DNA sequence: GCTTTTGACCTCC
RNA sequence: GGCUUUUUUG
DNA sequence: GGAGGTCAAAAGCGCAAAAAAGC
């Protein structure tokens, strides 16, 4: 579980770009596939998301290179 | 979907275009079956269906007939949801007028047509004729006229002049009106006229018609022709029990207005006398105007309930109307409510929740993981097992809220902390539990105070609300950088009596190993919680390079000290647990772990401090009893002194020898030092106590009693409330405020009789009272707040300005009210500091300040800095990061897209709860003498004489920063001259209070020059004084002929010539005003500047009062331009006064009563604006001569003046912003090579985005002037309507927008929360961006 | 008392008040003010439009909640529409723009 | 009833 | 399901 | 003759709740 986002939020500029990162990474793991980067707790989809935003391995940058290379199919 | 909102005007064939039939029958329903009438106002044909998919003839039914027409019946089949949009037009007989287009403030008619308003009522309700067309005649065209004139004519002149009645008449005037003849008929006119009064209504006139000119509307529609009707369904007939049918005001008033249409159409058919078509055609103009707008008119139309009824205004303005009520905010699903109660094993980021509660909110989300695990098929099955509450239900609830956030809220919600997300827990009951350290925060207290709980949905919620609204993100206010989860009550009086060690005490003088051992012994009952030893304890420092370093040694400290060490994290320093810790201490440790530690760290911190408050405040036992209240001994006695000091005032009252306020003063002064005596002698008794130590000899500790405990720690009470209990209450006071001169002898301990307690009430009720009635009035004020600002979002980095306000630290004069640390703390600066020393920079251009530049400043004492500010900053539209500052929630730089302006409206508007409606100078401190904007003279006594008015005193201290600054009027006395080595307690000016001076220029000898004796000076020699002294006679005697004489007391030397002072030599004459007694004679000798006459002479409303700069009811007159001071034509009613320039001009003139106190004379050379006048100072003129940056730092002060007073911290960051929006407008002075109208009224950022690129290019600019609004005017003129609809006057502001046809770009907050978009505020901002880009 | 989902007003389409009617909260004006204080958009725009009375899309909110997919549809409340033909029952013509 | 504000009529210079 | 009237709590 | 003075009319005056009645 997790309960403060402080160094997340240090990760990334500021919050709102953070939140908006987070809800687009849940929802690309809810809806389908996408294999969670880290392993699970039994925790829902949003939290999990975004511990993988303060390991520095998911942001704007990394998300946007993943899709189009999924999508060039 | 929809780029922006256009309002107009409408047509006739419009109105048709909408409409899908017309309307007969005024009849509605059967009301014998439930079946639609036919062509009446829920016709099936005009409208729609009933039934989904069925017509009322029923011969056509389900989806195959869709699309298709009845045959007789001929209602369309299709889903019944359209009966919410088609609507209907009534075809009114005659034309009738509109009544907002008639009767607004200003009348749209009226200045229109250019009539006053009484007569057009009177043509229209056919009381009075009017000509249309005068002809070849003597009538005006556009005359009144009444009936015996006409009649007259009638025969006089006949066919060759044309006049009419009614609507039809102002219908065929307005359509025979041309415009653009109109608008350059104008347009020659104004620059003819010379006349003010002229010109505003001129310019109105001419705007109005531009406005028609440009508009793709006519004015001939504003008369209506064809009547629309509102869709059935928004005024339903919904059926109660019974065959009685609910009916609304609207069926109701069209039913009406149909039946008296239908009858005048059947009337005129056979051609009726007109005496009986006037009556008919008036009182259906009646009939629609209540349609329209119900009372505006005269007497309002009533039903059965004998109140007026609702109409479509009604149903639109006012708090029950369709914005404030269904727009701005609207009832939710997913909400519950609950009763608050305390829980304090819960931790910081969760709250609890009753069961059945959770399983009613979570119910969809439940449904759905049941199918997924496969327990339940049909959702009916899922459902059938919900109710049931099954085992597996409790399991499956438990797993779907591990991290589900919800949100608290308690209204009032006053601050933006009012709603906190949380992390929900299941618990038993039926009651909410809540975490104790936030309810601080809520202001809520537990006595039946109630939550209510809403539930996120999507991902994007529960993300923003984890990210944004949880608890452990909101620990210091936005209002100021104070914590806000500050322990309180029953936590600090449990550290308190941890830390606080006896003189002798069980295990008391041991060496113990660490904490953990010091633990052992106090669980063991064989050490006393509290008792000094030494024992070995470790602490850590970050003192290296983000590294922790180990130190170990002994410290003397106590066993609970010890106890309470282990939950101490490890960057604190061992001394900050070292002391008594009372309220005032613990915080302030706290806060020492967020500057050091984070944030985990602090949290978890604060809640292992509250945990171990809470254990060790039980077992504690702390209770209060009678005994506790210790009352002094002296006291009674203490008392018989004072009665015997009145027993002797008294007497002086018989003998006659004192007066009633000598003897009131007296007994007063008595009574409050008797007072003050025994409050000292009680609390000296209370603190103390004496206890035998190791040795056996009496020792005094600070006291254990139960009362000083809770009252020193600071968890509840104050010293006010314990000289309650035990001494004597003190003065009391009558309602109106006098104070009663017998006090209230006795304390609450002890009894009161009866006529004390009665006094006592008095101030009560006044509370109470007060408490009531502000809460109504201070809220309200929040919200003109909250629209003025609600437009301020963040919107670029940098606006490239270098225009700044100075800040200095506020001083009256004595101590420093507000030091410059803090007022300047967590801003950028304008400009670089420059140090003392000359062309060294200290601090970079362009930094934000913080502690690490702030203890630079003090430690170099530089005076003031000038640092950038949000009223100054230039980006259009929005407001410059770096001007804002730094963001006081986190303590960074601000970023972009968030709301300032309702962040401020909201901080400045929360503390209103705490207000309430109802001749020597002294050096206080040691210090240097420093004066500067001063000139005076050296006198023949030797001190210095001052004439200077903006004379300010400075207290230099030893390296050169400024104490205190005083006000000194003209012809005091210095004893000490400027930059000596002065000290303190020394007295340094002196002047009388009560008289004015005359006093001369310079050393010289009065020469008796141009008096006029017997009308105009006279040699009183009153007996009472038996003294002869020159008396300038009174303004009633003289007259025009003796009044132009004015006594001339030239100052001149022994050769008398005029004054010989540097520059210039004007014969310095002095023209001595009434009521002047002129000691001196002629020959006596004169001092440098010596006297020749002496003439005689706030709470949360004042804030209210400064916001809408209201005029006070007595403004100080200020100057208006550079120059020397010039009387005129004077006594004219009012006085005359001219200012010269040196080289400009000078044909300023205003009015100024004699009445009224005069401080400038001839021999004075004035700068604009400079007082003339005493009293307060009106906002608009200070704007008007001193600028834009002299008008900001008045309010500011002023307001900060109150709350300071008041004890309230708020920062002058959020007080400027409404400032700000407050300077919104701005009104032309020359065209130029503009497109404006020089009397216009228009935004200054639209002029400044205008002109800019106008000057970029070959052109020139155009001047114009920024004005000052009231927030409450200054909301109602702003380009989106949509919000100043939504505000106030609606009436008013949706007709001044139709009739310009404005159209709104939706680009605001309010307006956007409307229309149910995302706010361009907050994460939706990038949204926006991405929006913009495209577009 | 909760409401998770129940009875809907006739006129206006917003959810009833008063616990005898099983009806939910009052989102007031003053909540309004401080949920925009907060960066928080997502949810006041959730609160406007969709738990309150966008009848074409929030049937399309539960149906999607069954699901397990957590997701949206903006769409325009109806609240709004009523004043604006409100408006046009005077002689005010409004009336929106294009995309 | 408070209070403000704005418009309109009288009138004093 | 709208309005009116009070009463009560915060 | 008009710019100033004085009198008259419109618009607003917390928010949540609950409970009842009555229309
Ligand atoms: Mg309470
Ligand atoms: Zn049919
Ligand atoms: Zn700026």
Redesign the interface.
């Known amino acids: 579980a997790r309960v403060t986002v402080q160094d997340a939020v240090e990760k990334i500029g500021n919050?709102?770009d953070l939140?908006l990162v987070a809800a687009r990474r849940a929802?690309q793991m809810?809806?389908g596939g996408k294999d969670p980067l880290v392993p699970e707790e039994n925790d829902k989809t949003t939290v999990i998301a975004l511990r993988e935003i303060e390991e520095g391995l998911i942001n704007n940058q990394i998300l946007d290179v993943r899709e189009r290379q999924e999508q060039q199919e | 979907?929809?780029?922006?909102?256009?309002?107009?005007?409408?047509?006739p064939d419009?109105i048709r275009s909408?409409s899908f039939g017309e309307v007969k029958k005024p009849e509605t329903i059967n009301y014998r079956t439930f079946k639609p009438e036919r062509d009446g106002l829920f016709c099936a044909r005009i409208f729609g269906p009933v039934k989904d998919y069925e017509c009322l003839c029923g011969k056509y039914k389900r989806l195959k007939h869709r699309g298709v027409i009845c045959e007789k019946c001929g209602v369309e089949v299709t889903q019944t949801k359209v009966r919410?949009?088609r609507?209907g037009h009534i075809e009114l007989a005659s034309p009738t007028a509109?009544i907002?287009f008639l009767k607004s403030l200003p009348s749209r008619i009226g200045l229109l047509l250019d009539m006053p308003l009484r007569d057009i009522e009177r043509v229209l309700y056919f009381e009075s004729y009017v000509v249309i067309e005068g002809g070849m005649t003597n009538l005006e065209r556009q005359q009144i006229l009444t009936e015996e004139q006409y009649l007259d004519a009638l025969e006089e002149f006949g066919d060759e002049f044309d006049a009419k009645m009614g609507a039809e008449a102002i219908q065929a005037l307005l359509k025979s009106m041309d415009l653009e003849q109109e608008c350059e008929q104008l347009r020659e006119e104004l620059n003819e006229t010379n006349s003010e009064t002229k010109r505003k209504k001129l310019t109105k006139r001419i705007k109005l018609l531009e406005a028609f000119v440009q508009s793709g509307n006519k004015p001939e529609?504003?008369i209506?022709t064809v009547l629309?009707?509102?869709?059935p369904?928004?005024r339903?007939l919904?059926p109660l029990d019974g065959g009685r049918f609910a009916t609304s005001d609207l069926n109701d008033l069209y039913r009406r207005v149909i039946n008296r249409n239908n009858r005048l159409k059947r009337l005129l058919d056979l051609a009726a006398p007109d005496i009986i078509v006037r009556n008919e055609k008036r009182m259906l103009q009646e009939a629609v105007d209540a349609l329209?707008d119900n009372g505006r008119r005269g007497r309002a139309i009533t039903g059965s309930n004998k109140r007026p009824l609702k109409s479509?205004?009604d149903?639109?303005k006012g708090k029950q109307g369709?914005?404030?009520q269904?727009?701005?905010?609207?009832?939710?699903?997913?909400?519950?409510?609950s009763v608050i109660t305390v829980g304090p094993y819960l931790r910081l980021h969760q709250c609890g929740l009753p069961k059945?509660?959770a399983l009613?909110?979570?119910?969809?989300?439940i449904?759905?993981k049941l199918?997924?695990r496969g327990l339940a098929t049909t959702?009916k099955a899922a459902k059938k097992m919900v109710e049931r509450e099954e085992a597996v239900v409790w399991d499956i609830l438990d797993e779907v809220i591990r991290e589900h956030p919800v949100?608290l809220?308690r209204?009032?919600?006053?601050?933006?902390l009012?709603?906190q997300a949380f992390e929900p827990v299941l618990i038993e009951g039926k009651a909410i539990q809540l975490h104790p350290l936030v309810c601080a925060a809520y202001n809520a207290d537990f006595d039946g105070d109630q939550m209510?709980?809403?539930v996120?949905?999507?991902?994007?919620?529960?993300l923003?609300?984890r990210a944004?609204?949880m608890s452990t993100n909101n620990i210091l206010s936005?209002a100021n950088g104070e914590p806000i989860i500050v322990p309180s009550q029953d936590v600090v009086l449990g550290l308190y009596y941890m830390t606080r060690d006896c003189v002798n005490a069980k295990g008391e003088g041991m060496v113990l190993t660490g904490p953990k051992e010091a633990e052992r012994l106090y669980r063991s009952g064989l050490a006393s919680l509290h008792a000094r030893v030494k024992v070995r304890i470790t602490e850590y420092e970050k003192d290296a390079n983000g590294e922790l370093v180990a130190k170990t040694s002994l410290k003397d400290t106590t066993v609970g000290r010890a106890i309470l060490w282990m939950i101490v994290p490890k960057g604190l320093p061992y001394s900050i647990v070292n002391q008594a810790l009372g309220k005032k201490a613990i915080s302030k440790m706290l806060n020492t772990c967020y500057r050091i530690l984070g944030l985990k760290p602090t949290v978890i911190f604060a809640d292992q401090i509250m945990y171990t408050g809470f254990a060790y405040a039980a077992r504690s036992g702390a209770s209060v009893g009678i005994d506790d209240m210790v009352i002094p001994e002296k006291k009674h006695e203490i008392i018989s002194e004072a009665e015997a000091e009145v027993a002797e005032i008294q007497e002086q009252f018989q003998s006659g020898l004192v007066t009633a306020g000598e003897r009131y003063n007296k007994v007063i002064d008595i009574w409050a030092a008797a007072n003050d005596r025994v409050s000292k002698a009680m609390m000296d008794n209370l603190q103390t106590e004496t206890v035998i130590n190791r040795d056996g000899q009496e020792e005094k500790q600070v006291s254990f009693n139960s009362i000083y405990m809770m009252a020193d720690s600071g968890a509840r009470g104050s010293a006010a409330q314990i000289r309650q209990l035990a001494g004597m209450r003190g003065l009391m006071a009558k309602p109106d405020g006098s104070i009663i001169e017998t006090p209230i002898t006795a304390n609450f301990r002890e009894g009161l009789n009866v006529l004390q307690y009665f006094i006592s009430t008095h101030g009560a009720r006044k509370g109470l009272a007060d408490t009531a009635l502000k809460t109504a009035n201070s809220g309200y004020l929040t919200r003109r707040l909250?629209d003025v600002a609600?437009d301020l979002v963040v919107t670029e980095d940098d606006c490239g300005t270098h225009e700044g306000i100075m800040m200095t630290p506020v001083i009256e004069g004595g101590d420093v009210k507000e030091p410059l640390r803090d007022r300047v703390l967590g801003r950028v600066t304008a400009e670089d500091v420059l140090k003392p020393g000359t062309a060294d920079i200290l601090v970079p251009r362009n930094t934000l300040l913080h502690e690490q530049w702030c203890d630079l400043l003090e430690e170099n004492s530089v005076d003031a800095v000038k640092v950038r500010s949000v009223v100054s900053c230039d980006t259009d539209f929005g407001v410059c990061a770096h001007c804002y500052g730094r963001d006081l929630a986190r303590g960074h730089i601000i970023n972009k897209?968030?709301?300032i302006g309702?962040?401020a409206?909201?901080s400045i508007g929360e503390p209103g709860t705490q207000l309430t409606m109802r001749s020597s100078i002294q050096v206080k401190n040691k210090g240097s003498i420093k004066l500067s904007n001063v000139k005076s003279v050296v006198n023949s006594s030797g001190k210095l004489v001052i004439t200077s008015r903006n004379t300010e005193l400075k207290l230099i201290d030893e390296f050169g920063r400024t104490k205190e600054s005083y006000k000194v009027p003209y012809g005091a006395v210095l004893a000490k001259g400027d930059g000596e080595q002065v000290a303190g307690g020394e007295t340094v000016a002196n002047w009388d209070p009560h008289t004015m001076p005359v006093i001369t220029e310079v050393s010289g000898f009065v020469r008796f020059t141009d008096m006029i004796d017997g009308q105009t000076i006279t040699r009183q020699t009153d007996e009472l004084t038996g003294l002869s002294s020159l008396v300038v006679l009174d303004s009633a005697e003289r007259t025009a002929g003796g009044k132009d004489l004015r006594p001339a007391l030239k100052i001149v030397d022994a050769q008398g010539n005029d004054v010989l002072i540097p520059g210039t030599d004007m014969p310095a004459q002095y023209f001595l005003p009434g009521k002047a007694i002129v000691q001196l004679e002629d020959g006596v000798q004169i001092s440098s500047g010596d006297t020749l006459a002496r003439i005689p002479q706030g709470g949360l409303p004042r804030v209210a009062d400064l916001f809408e700069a209201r005029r006070p009811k007595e403004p100080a007159i200020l100057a208006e331009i550079s120059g020397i001071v010039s009387f005129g034509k004077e006594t004219k009613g009012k006085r005359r006064l001219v200012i010269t320039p040196v080289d400009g001009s000078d044909p300023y003139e205003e009015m100024i009563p004699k009445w009224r106190q005069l401080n400038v004379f001839e021999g004075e050379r004035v700068e604009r604006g400079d007082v003339i006048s005493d009293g307060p100072e009106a906002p608009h003129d200070i704007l008007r001569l001193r600028g834009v940056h002299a008008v900001t730092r008045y309010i500011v002060n002023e307001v900060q003046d109150v709350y300071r007073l008041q004890g309230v911290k708020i920062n002058d960051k959020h007080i400027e912003v409404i400032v700000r929006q407050m300077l919104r407008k701005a009104t032309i002075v020359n065209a130029g090579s503009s497109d404006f109208l020089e009397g216009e009224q228009v935004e200054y950022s639209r002029v400044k985005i205008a002109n800019r690129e106008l000057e970029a290019n070959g052109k020139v600019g155009a001047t114009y002037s920024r004005d000052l609004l009231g927030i409450t005017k200054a909301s109602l003129a702003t380009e989106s309507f949509i919000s100043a609809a939504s505000f106030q006057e609606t009436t008013r502001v949706?007709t001044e927008a139709?009739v310009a046809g404005k159209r709104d770009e939706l680009r605001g907050?309010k307006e956007n929360?409307?229309?149910?978009?995302?706010?361009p505020?907050?994460?939706?901002?990038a949204y926006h961006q991405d929006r913009m880009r495209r577009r | 008392?909760?409401?998770?989902?129940?009875s809907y007003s006739?006129?206006?389409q917003?959810?009833?008040?008063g616990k005898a009617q099983f009806?939910?909260?009052?989102?007031?004006?003053?909540?309004?003010?401080?949920?925009?204080?907060?960066?928080?958009?997502?949810?006041?725009?959730?609160?406007?439009?969709?738990?309150?009375?966008?009848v074409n899309g929030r049937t399309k909110?539960?149906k999607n909640?069954?699901?397990?997919?957590?997701?949206?549809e903006?769409?325009?409340?109806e609240?709004?529409?009523?004043?604006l033909?409100?408006?046009?029952?005077?002689?005010?013509?409004?009336?929106?723009?294009?995309?």
């Open positions: 919050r709102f939140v929802r809810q809806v | 979907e929809f780029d922006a909102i256009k309002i107009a005007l409408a047509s419009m909408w919410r949009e609507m509109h907002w529609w504003m209506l629309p009707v509102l869709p369904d928004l339903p919904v329209l479509l205004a149903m639109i369709r914005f404030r269904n727009l701005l905010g609207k009832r939710v699903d997913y909400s519950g409510r059945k509660m009613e909110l979570f119910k969809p989300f449904y759905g199918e997924l959702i949100l809220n209204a009032p919600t006053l601050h933006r009012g709603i209510a709980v809403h996120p949905l999507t991902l994007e919620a529960q923003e609300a944004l609204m936005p909250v609600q897209g968030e709301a309702v962040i409206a909201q949706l139709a907050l929360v409307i229309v149910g978009r995302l706010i505020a907050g994460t939706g901002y | 008392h909760a409401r998770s989902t129940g006739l006129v206006t917003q959810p009833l008040g009806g939910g909260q009052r989102f007031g004006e003053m909540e309004v003010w401080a949920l925009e204080a907060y960066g928080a958009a997502y949810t006041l725009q959730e609160m406007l439009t969709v738990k309150s009375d966008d909110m539960y909640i069954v699901d397990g997919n957590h997701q949206m903006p769409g325009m409340p609240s709004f529409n009523v004043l033909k409100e408006i046009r029952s005077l002689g005010i013509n409004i009336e929106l723009e294009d995309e």
